[PDB]
Amino acid sequence: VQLQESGGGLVQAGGSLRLSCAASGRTFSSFVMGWFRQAPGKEREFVASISRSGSVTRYADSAKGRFTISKDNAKNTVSLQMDNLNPDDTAVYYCAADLHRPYGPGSQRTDDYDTWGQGTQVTVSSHHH
Predict the structure, then answer these.
(1) For residue 31, which of 91, 93, 104, 121 has the smallest C-alpha distance?
(2) Which of 29, 71, 81 is closest to 50 using CA atoms?
(3) Which of 11, 54, 69, 112 is the most buried (most CB within 10 A)?
(4) How many other CB atoms sit within 10 Å of the CB of residue 46?
């Protein structure tokens, strides 16, 4: 099972982006998927996760009330809608899958995820000029 992100890039402050992440390879079923982010010189941190069913989600404080995680189990893709971005959201965003977890949303711990994407760079310029 491999994961590939798309949708990152440079965006104006207050703009919005939708990241997506698609699974490929021999798949057994649907699985827990999550989003993490990491800026240079900083620890990788939780952003959002969703259950194998798609029914239940979790969000980091940073994402609450601005970002929305969703998934399409038919395509085994997960998406992060990111509204009202500001420069502090600048980071590389990584999608991840937990293939073990049969119940509940994804953990907030990086160590619980089997599979990682290569990341997509998101840069939020400030509004100036």
Answers:
(1) 104
(2) 71
(3) 69
(4) 21
Using the 8-state DSSP alphabet, how is residue 111 labeled?
G
Instruction: Report how far residue 95's alpha carbon sits from residue 105's, in angstroms, rounded to the nearest whole number.
Output: 14
Q: Cα–Cα distance between 90 and 86 in angstroms, integer?
A: 8
- Which tokens go with 8? 């990152």
Place of tokens 């038919």: 74
Are the C-beta atoms of 50 and 101 separated by less than 8 Å? no
- Both tokens of 99, joined, read 């293939």
This entry's atomic model was obtained through X-ray
Q: How many CB atoms lie within 10 A of CB 108?
A: 16
Q: Is 61 within 8 Å of 47 (Cβ atoms)?
A: no
* Specified resolution (Å): 2.0
